[PDB]
Design a protein around this motif. Sequence first.
Motif, PDB file in Angstrom:
ATOM      1  N   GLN A   1      12.446 -23.987   4.532  1.00 35.54           N
ATOM      2  CA  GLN A   1      13.466 -23.360   3.713  1.00 35.54           C
ATOM      3  C   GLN A   1      12.840 -22.918   2.403  1.00 35.54           C
ATOM      4  O   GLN A   1      11.800 -23.428   1.991  1.00 35.54           O
ATOM      5  N   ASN A   2      13.476 -21.954   1.754  1.00 32.88           N
ATOM      6  CA  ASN A   2      12.933 -21.338   0.546  1.00 32.88           C
ATOM      7  C   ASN A   2      14.081 -21.211  -0.450  1.00 32.88           C
ATOM      8  O   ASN A   2      14.749 -20.180  -0.510  1.00 32.88           O
ATOM      9  N   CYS A   3      14.295 -22.257  -1.238  1.00 26.96           N
ATOM     10  CA  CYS A   3      15.400 -22.306  -2.181  1.00 26.96           C
ATOM     11  C   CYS A   3      14.911 -21.997  -3.589  1.00 26.96           C
ATOM     12  O   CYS A   3      13.757 -22.258  -3.931  1.00 26.96           O
TER      13      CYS A   3
ATOM     14  N   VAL B   1       6.231 -26.463  -5.141  1.00 26.94           N
ATOM     15  CA  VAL B   1       7.199 -25.966  -6.114  1.00 26.94           C
ATOM     16  C   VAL B   1       6.471 -24.934  -6.961  1.00 26.94           C
ATOM     17  O   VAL B   1       5.660 -25.297  -7.818  1.00 26.94           O
ATOM     18  N   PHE B   2       6.752 -23.656  -6.734  1.00 27.88           N
ATOM     19  CA  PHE B   2       5.985 -22.588  -7.357  1.00 27.88           C
ATOM     20  C   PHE B   2       6.808 -21.871  -8.412  1.00 27.88           C
ATOM     21  O   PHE B   2       7.877 -21.338  -8.086  1.00 27.88           O
ATOM     22  N   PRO B   3       6.367 -21.820  -9.665  1.00 24.36           N
ATOM     23  CA  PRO B   3       7.133 -21.141 -10.708  1.00 24.36           C
ATOM     24  C   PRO B   3       6.724 -19.687 -10.883  1.00 24.36           C
ATOM     25  O   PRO B   3       5.606 -19.284 -10.564  1.00 24.36           O
ATOM     26  N   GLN B   4       7.649 -18.907 -11.437  1.00 22.74           N
ATOM     27  CA  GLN B   4       7.404 -17.489 -11.669  1.00 22.74           C
ATOM     28  C   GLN B   4       8.350 -16.975 -12.739  1.00 22.74           C
ATOM     29  O   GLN B   4       9.565 -17.137 -12.618  1.00 22.74           O
ATOM     30  N   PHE B   5       7.796 -16.338 -13.762  1.00 23.46           N
ATOM     31  CA  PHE B   5       8.583 -15.757 -14.840  1.00 23.46           C
ATOM     32  C   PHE B   5       8.967 -14.328 -14.506  1.00 23.46           C
ATOM     33  O   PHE B   5       8.129 -13.537 -14.067  1.00 23.46           O
ATOM     34  N   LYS B   6      10.234 -13.991 -14.732  1.00 23.51           N
ATOM     35  CA  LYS B   6      10.674 -12.604 -14.603  1.00 23.51           C
ATOM     36  C   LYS B   6      11.719 -12.339 -15.679  1.00 23.51           C
ATOM     37  O   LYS B   6      12.405 -13.260 -16.125  1.00 23.51           O
ATOM     38  N   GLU B   7      11.830 -11.080 -16.084  1.00 25.51           N
ATOM     39  CA  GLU B   7      12.540 -10.703 -17.303  1.00 25.51           C
ATOM     40  C   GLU B   7      13.787  -9.895 -16.942  1.00 25.51           C
ATOM     41  O   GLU B   7      13.775  -8.669 -16.833  1.00 25.51           O
TER      42      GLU B   7
ATOM     43  N   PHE C   1      11.891 -21.169 -10.229  1.00 20.13           N
ATOM     44  CA  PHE C   1      11.148 -22.110  -9.404  1.00 20.13           C
ATOM     45  C   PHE C   1      11.561 -21.938  -7.954  1.00 20.13           C
ATOM     46  O   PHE C   1      12.754 -21.885  -7.652  1.00 20.13           O
ATOM     47  N   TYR C   2      10.585 -21.859  -7.061  1.00 21.36           N
ATOM     48  CA  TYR C   2      10.837 -21.825  -5.628  1.00 21.36           C
ATOM     49  C   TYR C   2      10.424 -23.159  -5.036  1.00 21.36           C
ATOM     50  O   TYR C   2       9.240 -23.501  -5.056  1.00 21.36           O
ATOM     51  N   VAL C   3      11.375 -23.903  -4.509  1.00 22.44           N
ATOM     52  CA  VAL C   3      11.061 -25.112  -3.763  1.00 22.44           C
ATOM     53  C   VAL C   3      11.000 -24.756  -2.288  1.00 22.44           C
ATOM     54  O   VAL C   3      11.778 -23.929  -1.805  1.00 22.44           O
ATOM     55  N   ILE C   4      10.042 -25.341  -1.578  1.00 20.55           N
ATOM     56  CA  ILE C   4       9.855 -25.088  -0.156  1.00 20.55           C
ATOM     57  C   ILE C   4       9.849 -26.426   0.555  1.00 20.55           C
ATOM     58  O   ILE C   4       8.963 -27.252   0.319  1.00 20.55           O
ATOM     59  N   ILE C   5      10.830 -26.644   1.415  1.00 21.64           N
ATOM     60  CA  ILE C   5      10.979 -27.907   2.116  1.00 21.64           C
ATOM     61  C   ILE C   5      10.927 -27.654   3.613  1.00 21.64           C
ATOM     62  O   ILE C   5      11.282 -26.575   4.089  1.00 21.64           O
TER      63      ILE C   5
HETATM   64  C1  LIG Z   1      10.198 -17.571  -1.031  1.00 21.33           C
HETATM   65  O1  LIG Z   1      10.848 -16.338  -1.362  1.00 21.33           O
HETATM   66  C2  LIG Z   1      10.241 -15.595  -2.430  1.00 21.33           C
HETATM   67  C3  LIG Z   1      11.079 -14.354  -2.614  1.00 21.33           C
HETATM   68  O2  LIG Z   1      11.425 -14.164  -3.978  1.00 21.33           O
HETATM   69  C4  LIG Z   1       8.784 -15.283  -2.099  1.00 21.33           C
HETATM   70  O3  LIG Z   1       8.516 -13.938  -2.161  1.00 21.33           O
HETATM   71  C5  LIG Z   1       7.514 -13.145  -2.708  1.00 21.33           C
HETATM   72  O4  LIG Z   1       6.421 -13.961  -3.154  1.00 21.33           O
HETATM   73  C6  LIG Z   1       5.325 -13.225  -3.719  1.00 21.33           C
HETATM   74  C7  LIG Z   1       4.251 -14.233  -4.054  1.00 21.33           C
HETATM   75  O5  LIG Z   1       4.639 -15.545  -3.672  1.00 21.33           O
HETATM   76  C8  LIG Z   1       5.802 -12.437  -4.936  1.00 21.33           C
HETATM   77  O6  LIG Z   1       4.727 -11.646  -5.430  1.00 21.33           O
HETATM   78  C9  LIG Z   1       6.977 -11.543  -4.556  1.00 21.33           C
HETATM   79  O7  LIG Z   1       7.497 -10.908  -5.718  1.00 21.33           O
HETATM   80  C10 LIG Z   1       8.081 -12.357  -3.886  1.00 21.33           C
HETATM   81  N1  LIG Z   1       9.168 -11.492  -3.460  1.00 21.33           N
HETATM   82  C11 LIG Z   1      10.242 -11.248  -4.216  1.00 21.33           C
HETATM   83  C12 LIG Z   1      11.271 -10.334  -3.621  1.00 21.33           C
HETATM   84  O8  LIG Z   1      10.380 -11.744  -5.328  1.00 21.33           O
HETATM   85  C13 LIG Z   1       8.039 -16.560  -1.736  1.00 21.33           C
HETATM   86  O9  LIG Z   1       6.716 -16.256  -1.317  1.00 21.33           O
HETATM   87  C14 LIG Z   1       8.763 -17.295  -0.619  1.00 21.33           C
HETATM   88  N2  LIG Z   1       8.061 -18.516  -0.274  1.00 21.33           N
HETATM   89  C15 LIG Z   1       7.505 -18.707   0.924  1.00 21.33           C
HETATM   90  C16 LIG Z   1       6.804 -20.013   1.125  1.00 21.33           C
HETATM   91  O10 LIG Z   1       7.569 -17.862   1.808  1.00 21.33           O
END
Ligand SMILES: *[C@@H]1O[C@H](CO)[C@H](O[C@@H]2O[C@H](CO)[C@@H](O)[C@H](O)[C@H]2NC(C)=O)[C@H](O)[C@H]1NC(C)=O
Lengths: 394, 394, 394, 394, 394
Positions: free
Chosen positions: A141-143, A186-192, A206-210
Motif C-alpha cells: 500500500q502507498n499511503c 517512509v519517504f519525504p518530499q517537499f512540494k509547494e 510523507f509516503y508510508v509503504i506497508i
Molecule cells: C507512492 O505514490 C507516489 C505518488 O505520489 C510515488 O510516485 C512518484 O514517485 C516519484 C519518486 O518516488 C516522484 O518523482 C513522482 O513525482 C511521484 N509521482 C507523483 C504523481 O507525485 C511513489 O513512488 C509511490 N511509492 C511506491 C513505493 O510506489
Amino acid sequence: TTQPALLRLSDHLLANYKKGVRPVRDWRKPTTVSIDVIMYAILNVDEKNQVLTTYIWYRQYWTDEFLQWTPEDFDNVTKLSIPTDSIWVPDILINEFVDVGKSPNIPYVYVHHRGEVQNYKPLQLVTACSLDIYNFPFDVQNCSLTFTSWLHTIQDINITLWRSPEEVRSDKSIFINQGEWELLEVFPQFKEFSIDISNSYAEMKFYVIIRRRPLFYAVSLLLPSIFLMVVDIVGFCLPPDSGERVSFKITLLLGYSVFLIIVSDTLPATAIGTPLIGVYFVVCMALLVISLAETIFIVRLVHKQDLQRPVPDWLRHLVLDRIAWILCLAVRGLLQELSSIRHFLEKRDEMREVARDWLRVGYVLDRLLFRIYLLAVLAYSITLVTLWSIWHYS
Amino acid sequence: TTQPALLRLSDHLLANYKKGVRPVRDWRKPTTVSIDVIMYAILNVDEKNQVLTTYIWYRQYWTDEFLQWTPEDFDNVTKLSIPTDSIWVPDILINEFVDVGKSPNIPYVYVHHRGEVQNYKPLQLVTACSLDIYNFPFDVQNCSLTFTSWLHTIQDINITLWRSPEEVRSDKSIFINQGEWELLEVFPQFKEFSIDISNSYAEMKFYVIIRRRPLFYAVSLLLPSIFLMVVDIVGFCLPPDSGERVSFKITLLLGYSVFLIIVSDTLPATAIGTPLIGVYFVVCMALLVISLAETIFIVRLVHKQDLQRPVPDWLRHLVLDRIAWILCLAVRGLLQELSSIRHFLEKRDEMREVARDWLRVGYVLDRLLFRIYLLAVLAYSITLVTLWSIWHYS
Amino acid sequence: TTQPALLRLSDHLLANYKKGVRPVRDWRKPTTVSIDVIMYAILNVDEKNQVLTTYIWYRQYWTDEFLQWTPEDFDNVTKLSIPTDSIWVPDILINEFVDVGKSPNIPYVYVHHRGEVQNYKPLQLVTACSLDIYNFPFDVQNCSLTFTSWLHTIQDINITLWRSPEEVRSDKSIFINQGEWELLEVFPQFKEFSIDISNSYAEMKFYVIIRRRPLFYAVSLLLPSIFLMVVDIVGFCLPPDSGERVSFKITLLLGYSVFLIIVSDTLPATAIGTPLIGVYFVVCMALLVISLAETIFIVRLVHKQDLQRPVPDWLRHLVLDRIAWILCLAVRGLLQELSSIRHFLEKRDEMREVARDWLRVGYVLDRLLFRIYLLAVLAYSITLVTLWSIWHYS
Amino acid sequence: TTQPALLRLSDHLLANYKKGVRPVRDWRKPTTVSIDVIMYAILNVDEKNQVLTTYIWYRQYWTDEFLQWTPEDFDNVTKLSIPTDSIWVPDILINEFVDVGKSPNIPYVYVHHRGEVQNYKPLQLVTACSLDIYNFPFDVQNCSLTFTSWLHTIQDINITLWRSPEEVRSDKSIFINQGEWELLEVFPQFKEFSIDISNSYAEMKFYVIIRRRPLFYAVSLLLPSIFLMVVDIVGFCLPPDSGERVSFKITLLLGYSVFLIIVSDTLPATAIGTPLIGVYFVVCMALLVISLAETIFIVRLVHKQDLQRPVPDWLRHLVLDRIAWILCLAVRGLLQELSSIRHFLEKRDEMREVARDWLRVGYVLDRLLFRIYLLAVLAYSITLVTLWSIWHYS
Amino acid sequence: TTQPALLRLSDHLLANYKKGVRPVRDWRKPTTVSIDVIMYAILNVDEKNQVLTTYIWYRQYWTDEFLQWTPEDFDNVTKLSIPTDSIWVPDILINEFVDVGKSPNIPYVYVHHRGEVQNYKPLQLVTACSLDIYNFPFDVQNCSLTFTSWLHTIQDINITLWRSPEEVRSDKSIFINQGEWELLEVFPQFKEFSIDISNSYAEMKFYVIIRRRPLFYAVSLLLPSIFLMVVDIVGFCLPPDSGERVSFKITLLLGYSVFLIIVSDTLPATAIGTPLIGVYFVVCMALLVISLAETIFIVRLVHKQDLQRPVPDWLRHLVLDRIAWILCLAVRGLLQELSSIRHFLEKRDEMREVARDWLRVGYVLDRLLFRIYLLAVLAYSITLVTLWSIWHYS
Ligand SMILES: *[C@@H]1O[C@H](CO)[C@H](O[C@@H]2O[C@H](CO)[C@@H](O)[C@H](O)[C@H]2NC(C)=O)[C@H](O)[C@H]1NC(C)=O
Ligand SMILES: *[C@@H]1O[C@H](CO)[C@H](O[C@@H]2O[C@H](CO)[C@@H](O)[C@H](O)[C@H]2NC(C)=O)[C@H](O)[C@H]1NC(C)=O
Ligand SMILES: Cc1nccn1CC1CCc2c(c3ccccc3n2C)C1=O
C-alpha cells in the motif's frame, strides 16, 4: 540585583510577552519550522471505509526573536523549560484527517538561548487513503501524510526537514512488528501547493509503504479449499449403480457453498469487483459442478428402466477400442404348458442381459472420466504452485 | 513612538475590544457572512437510522468596524493573525444535526486592514436525511445541508455565498473516491425562512447528490442466484423412478433458504417494504417450487403400488400425439398342477406390464415439462438482461 | 457622554454584575422560567436495556432585574446579544437521565430591555423508560420526560409553559419520518413534587407517545412462516411406501428450527416472557409435528414385515364405510414333486396378498388425514387474517 | 449601608475566600462529610469482563467556618445558592473504578447560615466486581461500592452517614424495574482502612445485592431442550428394517449440535468452568447417543446378509420368557430334473426363514428397549421438576 | 501578626509562586521523582491488535525548595493539602501508549515542611505489547511498561523507585482474580536510555507477567472434539451392505466441518500461522477421512454388479490365514424343456453364490480394519494425556 533563585530569567522574558503575535522582528521574514516523523504502530487498516489508523512520534523546532537572552549574567544557563500554553505555537495539520485521534498532551517545551524552541509530542492520527485490493494477501500500500499549515501562506510559515531525507527513509527502529503489517520505508518530499496567484501553501508530504504478511491467509482459506478437493477424489471410488453417489456429491456442494459465504464476510473487496482470489474460487466451483455433471450422466446410463440394446456403433467404438487406451393329446397339451413357462423365463433372463451390457459401458466411461478429472486437478495444482514460486523468489 | 517590535499593532486594536458585542457602528445594519463548502469524504450512510456522516472543508468571512487600521505608520503591514477566542464569531449551525462530530480546532484567523476577518475550519458533521431504497443497487440520494444562524434574525446576520453558484456545483477536486459512493454535484440555494411576522431567519441550503456504485452487489447476491439455477438444470437429468431425485430437490431448497436469510441481514429496507430486488427473489422461489411440484407429480405416477390400466383416453392423447410435438386320471391331475403354476406366473408378468406403460407415460411428461421449464428460465433471463442495458446505456 | 460606539450599553450592565447570585431584588419572589419542546428525531429504542435515545429542540426564558435599561438614551436599542457564560443560568435537568448526550453549545442569548432573557438550545438526551412488548409489531409506547430544577426548591425556581398545552400536543412539524417510529402526540402536564414538608420541587412532565410501523416485520418473519406451510402441503403428495417421505419431513423440520433461532436473535422480549408472536409460532411447530406424527404412522402400517391378516372389524369399518365419506409308482413320485413346488409358490403369492390389503388401508387413511390437515391449516389461516382486519379498520 | 440589592451578602463572604485551603479554624479538627445513596438503575452486568455499570443519586454535606453569617442584618436570609467551582469540595472517590462514566454536572450548592454546605449530584459509575455463575438463571450477586477520600487521611476527612442505616437498607423507591435485575437491599458499613501506622483512611462501604429474573431463560433454552426429546419419542415408532430410521436419528443429532453452539455464545461462564446448566445438557447428549446406540444395534441384527440360525440358548431366553414380561429311463431322467428344481426352491424358502426368526427377535428387543428409554426420560423429568419446586417455594 | 485562621500559611507560600519553572535553587541539580505501581485489574487482552488494557494504582514524590517553611510559628503544622493545578508537576508518560484511557482526576496533593510533595492517582492505560500464541491455552505473557520523562533529559529529571524492588515483585494484594488472567509478578528495572551523546533520558521499566487460566478452553473445544470420536466408534457397527453407512459417515464430516469454522472465529492466531492446537485438529481430520476411506472400500467390494470369482491367491491369504489372527419323441421333447428350465435356475443360484464369497471377504476386512482404527485412536489418546501430565506436575 539579588540572588533569590533563578526564576528571574523566566520573569525576564515572559513578563510582557504576547502569545498571539507571530514572533518576528521584521514582519517580512517567514517563520521556518523543521519537522520529522518516526513510525510506531499500524493500529488498523479499514479496507471497506478507506481509512488508515496509525500512531507516530513527532517533533519540530522553530525560531523566535522574543525568547533570547545572554547566557552569562543569568548564572550560565543555556536552556530551560517553558509551559506550552504560554508561547506561540504554529498550526501544523494534516490534509487527510477524517477524525480526531486521542493522544497525550506534553505540557513543556525547550528554549535555547538563541530562540530555538523545540517541541516533542506523540499523536495518533486517522487518515483517508486509497487501498487497492487487486491481489489480496500479497499487496503493498502507498499511503500519504501531508503536513501543512492550515491558515498561514508561504511568506508566513515555511516547512523544512529536521534531518536529511536519507535517514528518514531507512529508519525502522521502534516499529512494533508481529502485527499483520510490515513497514518498508517512509519517504519525504517537499512540494509547494498553490490555489492561485499570491496564495501559496508550503507542505511536506510523507509516503508510508506497508506490506501485508500473507501467512494469516494460508490457513484460513487455502487449507479448506484443497481439503474438499481430496474428498471428491475418494468420492469417485463409489460404484455408480449403488445410489448414494448422487447423495454424496450434493452434500459437499452444500458443504462448500457454506464455506464461500462464511469466509467472504471477512474478506473485503472495493472498487475493482473481486480480487484475484475470487477468480480462483470460481474455478473451484466449476471444477466441482463438472464432478456433479458426470455422475449425473453415468446414473442415467446405468439404470433398469426397460431399455433397449446398446448401439453396435457405440459398442465397437467403446468396449473394443478403449481396451488399449486406458485399461488392458396329453403329450401335446403338457408341451404347450412347458413351452409357455420357458417363454416366461427366456423373457426374464434377457432382461438381466439388459444391464450387463450397459453396466459394462458405464464402467468404462467411469474410469475414462476419472483419469481426465484427475489430470485437470493435477494440471491446475502445479499452476497454483508455479505462480507462488515467482513471488517467493526475491 | 519607538520601535520595540511590531506587536504594537496588536496592542492597539485588542486593548479595549469587547468580544461580546456584535461589531457594527450603527446597530441597524446587519453583519453579512459569506460561506462556501467543498466536499471531502462520505464516511457512512446508515439506511436503517436515516443518518448521513460526512466530512467537509468550510470557510467564511465577515466584516467588523472595530478591527480597522491604516496600513502605513505600522510599517506597511496589511494583514495579521489573531487568535480565534478573542474576537466575535457568528453562530452558524446546521438544521439537520442529530449528534456532534469530532473535528480539529483552528486557533487563528486572518484580519485585513479593512475589517475582513477570514476563518478556515474543517468540520465533521452527522446529519439526518431521507433515503429511498426503492431500487437498491442503482439509487441516487438527495441530502440537504442547511446553514443558518441559530439565534440572530435576518436584520442581524445575513448569509451570502463566497463565490458564484456555478463554481460550487462543478467542484469535485479533493473528493476521495473508491468508497462505494460517487459525488455528482453540490448545488446551493438561498431561501428566507420565517416563523411568523417580524422573525425571519436567513439560511443557505446545499443539496448534495450521491450515487451508489453498484459493482459491490453483483458478486455478493447476483452470482449465487444464477448459480443455483444451473444446479436445477442438471438436476432434471435424473430418472424419476430412482429415488434420489426427491432428496436432490429438497436439499438445495434448504440450501437456498439459508441464502435468503444470510444475505437479507446485510441489505436494508425502510418505509417501502421491499426494494425491487426482493421482488426478483420471490420469482426465484416460485420458479423453484414449480421445479419441486413437477418432480412430486412424476414420482406419484411412476411407482409400483398395484395399480390399474392407463386410460385409453390418455394413451391416445399422450403417447401417439406427443410423438410429433417434442420427440420423434394322472394325465389330468398333473395337468391341473401345471395350469395352476402357469396361472401363478401369468399373473406375475402382467404386473411387470403394469409399470412399462406408466414408465412410458412418465418419461414423455418428463421431457415435455423439461422444455417448458427450460423456456421459462430462458424467457426470464433475457428480461433481466434487457432492463440492465437500459440503465447502462447513458 | 461621547459617541464611541454602542458597546457602552454592554459596559453599563456587565461592569459590576455577579453571575453567581439568583437575580432578584427581593429574595422572597421566585424566578419563573418558561419552557417548551418540539420533537425532532427518535434515534434509537433499546428494548433490552429499557433506554430511549431522542433529539429535541428546546427553549426557555426567565426574568432578571439586573439586566434592565431604558431604551432611549442608548440610541433606541431594545435587545442585544450577550454571551451565555457571563449571566445567571438556571439548572433545568431531566429525572430520567442515564447518560450524557453530545449536543452543540449555543454561546449567545437575547436580552430585552425589561430583563426577559431568551435561550435557544438543542440537546440530545438518553433516558430510561418502561417498554411493553406484549404485542410486538403493533405497539404504542408511553415515555416520560420530566424537566425539573435539581437543587432549587419551589420558592426559588418555578416552571411554567411558554405557550398553551394545546399547541404542544398538536405539533408535528419538523419530525423526521421514514424511521420505524411514528410520533403521535407530546402532552405536557405540571405536577408539584415534594419529598416532605417545606421541600417541594416544581416539575414539568412531557409524555411522548410513539407507535412502531409494522411494515418491516411482515417480510422478515411472516413471509417464511407461510412459505414452509405450502412445502408441507405438496409434501403429502408422495406415496408412503416410497421411502423418501420420512426423509422429506425431517429435513424441513431441521430447516424451520434454524429459522426459529436466527430470527429470535433480532426480536427482543422483556418482563413478560414472550409476546403474542411467540404464541403463534408454537402453533406453527405443533401443526408440523402432527404432520410428522401421521407420516410416522402410515409407514408403520404400510410395510413388509411378514405380517398377518387385516382385522375384519377394521376392514368393514374402514374400506366399506369411507367409500361414501371422502372418496367415491413314477406317476405318484412326480406328482409329489409338483405338489411341493406348487406349495412353494402358493405360499409366495399370498405373501404378495399381504401388502395389497394393507396398502389399501394405508391409502384410505392417507387421504382421510390429508383432508383434516388441510382444514386445520385453512381454519387457522382465516383466524390470523380476521384479527388483522380488526387492527387495520380504524 | 444602603439597600442596592441582596447580593451584598455574597460580596461579604466570597471577597477574600480561598478555595484551596481545607476550611477549619483549628487545623487539628477533621472535616466530617455525611453521605448517602439511593439506587436508580442497573444499566449493564458484564459477566465476562467482571464489570458492573449502574447509575445512582448521591448527596453529601459538610461544615466550614468561613461561610458563616448572622441571619439578621441581611434581611433575614438563611440560605442561598453559591456556584460549585468557587468553594472547597472534598474528593470522595470509589475504590472499584475501572473507567469514568458520563454524568451531568450540577453547578450550584446550598449554604445555610451555620456553614452547612449541601451538595446534590447524580453520577454514573462503572465498577469491577466478582460474579459467580455457579447457578446461571438463579443467582444473587454481592457487589461493593467503597466511598473513600483518595488523598486525605482520617485526621483530615472523616465519613459518616446522613441518615440511619435502617432507612438505607429498605429504600426501593425510584428503582427502574422490568430490566432483568431486581434490587434486594443496599446495606452500608463503615470500616477504618489503614496501610500502616499513622496513615489511616476512612471509608464507607455499600453492598448492593441484585437477583436475576429467570423468566428470560426458560423460553430461550428450556423450550427447545424438551422439544427435541419428544421428536425422539415419536422416532422409535419407525420399524427398524425400513432404512430411514438411521437417517432419522443422525439428522436431529446434527440438529441439536447446532443448538448447543448457537446458545452457548450468549451464555457466559467464568472461573468455574461451567454452571449447573452445562451439566444438564451433557445428560441431554448422553440420553440421545444411547438412543442412537440402540438403533445401531437392532439394524445390525435385523438384516439379510446370508446369516445362520438364531441360537436356541437365546431363543428360549428371549421369545418365550419376554412373552410375560412386556408383551402378552425317461421316468428317471425327468425325475432327476424336477428334484433338482425343488432343491433350488427349498434352498430359497429357508433363506426367507432366515429373517422371520431374526425379525421376531429384533422386534421384541425393540419394544423392550423402548420401555426402558421411556422410563429414563420419565425418571429424569420429575427430578428436573422437583428441584424447581424447592426454589419456587419461599 | 494576628490569628485570623491558619490559611495564612497557604497565603505565605503561594503568593509569588510560579508554576512554570522547574523548582530548584541551583539549576544544575536534577529533580528526582520516585515512583512505584501496584496492579489492580487486567481489563482486556486483544491478541489480534496486540493491545493490552490494564488499570493500576500509581504514586510518586519529588522535592522542591520553594514549598518550605518552619513548622513552628505556624502553630506546629507539618503538612497540608494544596490543589494540583497550582504547583509544578513532572511529565511522566509511558512509551507504549497507543490511546488515552479515561481515569478520575485527584485534585489535591500533600506537601510536607521540607518540600516533599506526594501525589496519588489511579490511571487506566492502554498499551502495545508482543503476544505469542504458540501454545494457546497454556501461555505466559511478558508485557512492558516504561515510565519516562517525555521532554526533560537526565540532568533535569531522574527517576528512582519508592521502595526496594523486592517488595514490588511480591505484591499481589488488591488484584482482582476470577478473570481469565492470573498475575505472577511485576519486576522493575532501571535503564538509562540515550539517543546520542549529551541527550540521555532516564526511564524505569516494569515487566508484568500474566498467565492464562486454561479452564475456559477445555469445555468449549476439547469436549466436542472427543465427542465426535465416539460417534464414529459406534458408527462401524453398521454392516456395510446396508446402505446407510456411507450416508452416516458423510453427515458427521459435515457436522465436524461446521465445528471447525464456528470455533476458529473465537480463537486468534498471529505471526506464527497456527498454534499447537491447530496441529491437533488436522490430526482429528486425518483420523476421520481414513474412517471414510475404509467404508468407501468395503462397499466397493461388497456389492452385486455381476462380478467374477474371488481370486484363490486372495482366498487362501485372507479367509484361512486371518482365522488365527483376529477371529477364531415326447419323452425327449419334455426332457429338453425341463433341462432348459434347470439351466435357467442353475445360472441364478450361482449368482447368489457370487455375493456370499465376497460378503465373507468383506466382513473379515471390516473386523480387521476395525481393530487397527481402534488402536490408532487409543495410541493417540494416551499421547494427548501424557503431555498434559507434564504440564500439570509442577
Ligand atoms: C507512492 O505514490 C507516489 C505518488 O505520489 C510515488 O510516485 C512518484 O514517485 C516519484 C519518486 O518516488 C516522484 O518523482 C513522482 O513525482 C511521484 N509521482 C507523483 C504523481 O507525485 C511513489 O513512488 C509511490 N511509492 C511506491 C513505493 O510506489
Ligand atoms: C521478560 O522479558 C525481559 C526482556 O527484557 C526479560 O529479560 C531479561 O531478564 C534478565 C533478568 O530478568 C535481564 O538481566 C536481561 O537484561 C533481560 N533481557 C533484556 C534483553 O533486557 C525477563 O526476564 C522476561 N520475563 C520472563 C518471566 O521471562
Ligand atoms: C521515547 C522518548 N523517551 C524520551 C523522549 N522520548 C521521545 C523521543 C525520543 C527520541 C526521538 C523522538 C523522535 C520523534 C521524531 C523523530 C525522531 C525522534 N527521536 C530520535 C522522540 O519523540
